[PDB]
Design a protein around this ligand. Sequence first.
Ligand code: HEC
Ligand code: HEC
Ligand code: SF4
Ligand code: SF4
Lengths: 382, 171, 445, 49, 52, 148
Amino acid sequence: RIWAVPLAIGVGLLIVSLVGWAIDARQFYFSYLVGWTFCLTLALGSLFFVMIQHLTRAQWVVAVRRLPEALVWTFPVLIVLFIPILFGLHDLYHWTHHELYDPSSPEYDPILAGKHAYLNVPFFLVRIAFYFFIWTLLAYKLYTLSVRQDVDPDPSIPAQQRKVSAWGMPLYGVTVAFASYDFLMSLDPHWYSTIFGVYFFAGSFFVALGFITTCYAILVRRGTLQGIVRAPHFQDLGKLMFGFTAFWAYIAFSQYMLIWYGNLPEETLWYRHRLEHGWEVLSQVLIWGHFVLPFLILLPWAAKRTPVLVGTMGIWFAIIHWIDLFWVAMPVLHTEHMTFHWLDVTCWLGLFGVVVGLFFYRISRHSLVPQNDPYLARSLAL
Amino acid sequence: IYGLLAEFSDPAALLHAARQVRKAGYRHFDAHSPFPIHGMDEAMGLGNSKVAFITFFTGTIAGFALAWWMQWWMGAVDYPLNISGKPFFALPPSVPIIFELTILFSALAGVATMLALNGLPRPYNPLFYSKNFMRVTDDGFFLFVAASDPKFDPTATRQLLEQLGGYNIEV
Amino acid sequence: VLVQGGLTFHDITELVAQHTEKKTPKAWWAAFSVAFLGMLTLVAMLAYQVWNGVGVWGNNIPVGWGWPIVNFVFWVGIGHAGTLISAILFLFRQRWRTSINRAAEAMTIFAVICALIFPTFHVGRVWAIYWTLPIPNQMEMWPQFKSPLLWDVFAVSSYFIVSLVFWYVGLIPDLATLRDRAALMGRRLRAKILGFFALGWCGANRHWRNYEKVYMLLAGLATPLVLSVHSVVSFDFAVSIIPGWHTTIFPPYFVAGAIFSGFAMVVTLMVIARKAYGLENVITIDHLEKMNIIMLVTGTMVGFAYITEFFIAWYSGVPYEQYAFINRATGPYAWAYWTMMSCNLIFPQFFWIKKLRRNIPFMFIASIVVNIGMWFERFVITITSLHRDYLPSSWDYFVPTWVDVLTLIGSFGLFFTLFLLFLRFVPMVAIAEVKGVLPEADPHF
Amino acid sequence: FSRKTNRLPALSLAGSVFGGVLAVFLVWYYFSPEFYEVGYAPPYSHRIH
Amino acid sequence: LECHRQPELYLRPQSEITTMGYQPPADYIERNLERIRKEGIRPPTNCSACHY
Amino acid sequence: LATVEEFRKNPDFAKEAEPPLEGLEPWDQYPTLWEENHPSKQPAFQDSDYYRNQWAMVIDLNACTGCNACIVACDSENNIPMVGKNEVGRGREMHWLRIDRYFVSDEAHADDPQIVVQPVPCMHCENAPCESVCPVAATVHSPDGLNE
Ligand code: HEC
Ligand code: HEC
Ligand code: SF4
Ligand code: SF4
């Protein structure tokens, strides 16, 4: 079926990648992070797409509204996929080792009075298990709603979605910041950067715009529809992919020029990442391939709105987040030897299939385009 | 004979009415109204898009080359300086000039085109002193024809006779 | 619907004409008195300055800057509001900005004027600033492009220009309208000859399509510049080695400060441009309602950064950056930061109560107070970590002189002086697109 | 209004172009305000010595 | 500064330097650079030289 | 500060307060992001009659106590003006060589001051943030560590 092929091939591949958790152990936990958080950024990005669609309300991109909402209930499934981190969590973050604060080791890493309150691995349990009570609660309060305004239309149809956006809104941006400050800030904790809570955010809402976009571009050609969602719908998605590629590269470069300048001890993210060990290769071929080829190819409005291109971009626009995030997650291990392993990729094509398994099975579970909705024909007859 | 006028108070006619005449008859080089009658160039205005993005081509390149030449000529080769060990016009501190200074010299060319499409500075406008075009913004949403090869003859006045016009000046 | 007015396409022209028809206002004659008096106080102390020397401002050497550059970030951060509701609101195409837009790049461009004077004048050697420009000068010398103080120059010398040229182009249909009126009904027959800024306007098909894509262009081409102008003016801080600056979140932050500052002044102008000389039918109160969201967005995005600052002091800070923010709360400027953050956080989180508080008189008493924290935001962030930075030897309070304050005041003076000046000449409202967007301009009738 | 402002882009363009021509073919910045034959107290006359 | 970037167009062999009626020889330049290779003059390009 | 007892134990204690990193180089001569395009590896900083002799200026702080003549010869050799009470009150002084003193007690045990004096001229850096930042190129790492 349409729902089980990304799932059976991806979970067929994920169950194969059990070999990673068994063999070449410490490799697979962190190929799992670069994959796991990608699925989370996919959840994180396309959810914020729904939010901003409601705050400054936009009845022009609403045919591309129901489908992000499907993407969100991933994140509850992303809970039970937190497990492989936890067995390797004592092996990853380097503050879980607890032979370093003031035990008999030669190291008294200045973490005792500074960080140990914020980080203590039973606290890390709640610092994320708390987020499951929010980012899922948005699902059970939004996805339960927006799927339900179709069959059981309300007197107050959107303004309940606004209520999520009235108090469930800011907590999101907070928990994204502290999440990034808890997951990906901490691999090389000899580093202090305030922006990086947004590089994870923007680098998510960067991507998931593409996945939502390419899905229709796939589901327009030999899909269940072919002409309902008109071209100038995607014309806005381009205007978003530029307006958020800016909000990425502004951030990925403000992380760079600021730290390229000062040369501080916090720089040691990049004395090990950028220059050395086959990764100046990465950053160059990244940025040429991550900002300028999109910002150049999509630019002119004579093929910017065409479906199959922006669909072709969602591949080059989201497959690349592997290359964006493999510049953050894994290199603290292969700092010695830039030899990216087969296990680095099985979880990329795995979770990017497994998330999409659930994503179609829910679109198999119920409708695709909302059978009734405010301003639908206003966006369809456009 | 420089052209016609059509007092159309309808905001909507200019889509459907004027689309008749670009097909049936002549080209209608010039339609007149303040605001964008929406969905015009869908069929009416004869355009895939603006053309002068291809003329915005030379705006970005020269400015980009300007800054990038303002530093390969400046930071290393002619009067360099060991300011803070900065490696001689390494990209990043050049980005907010190789980006931003491009915007100025590339925008102004983006508007030099705008001031060049049929050469907007032509205050000489032998129709504009028409004694009733002077309520352009409010009265109606007008039409016009230069003396094209299908020359403005009584048939055109007869054509727009049934395209409901408050009046028909003939400059 | 997003404007409440019993209007047609014509009803605006008679009204905005009456706002530019005849020259006999009285409140003008008071504003041009007190404001120009403010400008007089400005130059009365600004050439008193340069003939004498910088130190009449209250600047010690550790805090070399004080209130002038603080006001530069203010009087440019205040201005991004105007250009971005011209650009952003077309990018998202909310079809909503039209009631206020043309009055906003004014509120930007004059801010940029009273801004740019500071980089020309908080220096001690003003006359030798053309060296900063990349002219091939009388020797083989050229500026240093690793310096954000230079990026500021090109940025503002481009941002004064792009925002102008995007405003001047924005107001072509006005000059068309006024050039059209000057003949048949208006000031004089010789206002038409003054309105050659119409530039042979006729509202034609051939170039109106181009006007749209250009307005699209500058929207998608001034926003990438706006996000670089104020970011440059933040890069100058955060590029440094200071702990209270080197924190990398600042360029998005100060930008949000520019939002949370600029709209915090536009509302001050719209309230007073709504009571006596107001447009009830075009400046709908529902507009200010949906206006304060994008303020209240940055009413919390500004707040999240304070948490990060206040957090990273506890997470992995240098033992100085640990102290750098304890200074901000606990120390000399406890009067500032406790109240400032609380001012910039209470009032926005006290703002959304009665459906965003549509009530007009609360807007003035709040929009001020929202902004006063901004002048503190840049007097705090800049200076509170510029003393008490990496030595006790460089510990010194900042005593601002009585000339620091008359320059601040004078910045309000020249702002109002020149904002009012062209505003009475140009039309306030973006009357071209107002009657073109929400009313029956749609061909579906 | 006026019929022959087709000539007006010329003086706008050309006089602006001449703005550049008059700028750079006029500079002589450290060649005009340098050279001079000052009157000494006595004339040494390096010629003769 | 044109000399401190392009010196060998100007410098004299030091034999009777104060000679106003001095036409230099042919093959002047290559006869000079052999001195900068040997004498090792290395003119200044910096701010430290004269401005302090 | 440090004792002869402690000094006898760890001669590498001037670094121990902020030592080098996990496995990375000693602190001076520590590479930046850039090492291949670093100006010391480019000619235009390296090509003069100066690079022969890099200049530096240590301070045997063990014999430095507030004689305060370290200043005054700077004031006369490399000229300055003075400053008035009415002016220095706002905190400006045109003495280049601060001779700042400091107190260190045992966490305020018996209020034993146990002062320290240490001069602090402009340690004319290599990485030198100040050099980078003058837009009007009034600073440069002149040859020989001089940052003039
Ligand atoms: C040739 C045409 C020259 C002109 C004109 C100027 N200078 Fe020169 N200078 C020249 C040479 C060949 C050398 C190098 C000699 C060596 O063996 O090193 C120099 C060197 C200097 C220095 C050296 C540094 C020092 O000893 O303090 C200085 C300060 C200097 N030159 C200054 C200087 C000034 C101020 C000039 C014009 C105003 C100038 N030079 C012109 C050759 C030539
Ligand atoms: C001689 C060895 C010099 C070197 C090397 C540099 N400068 Fe120069 N500069 C020099 C002179 C003799 C003059 C006077 C020219 C005049 O106008 O009469 C100058 C001029 C300047 C100026 C302008 C000062 C003015 O009054 O207009 C500046 C700002 C300047 N020089 C800066 C400068 C810098 C930054 C240099 C390297 C870092 C530099 N100069 C080299 C002599 C010499
Ligand atoms: S204070 Fe200066 S001059 Fe006095 S003893 Fe110390 S080093 Fe010498
Ligand atoms: S920045 Fe300049 S003055 Fe300051 S310590 Fe470094 S070299 Fe010395």
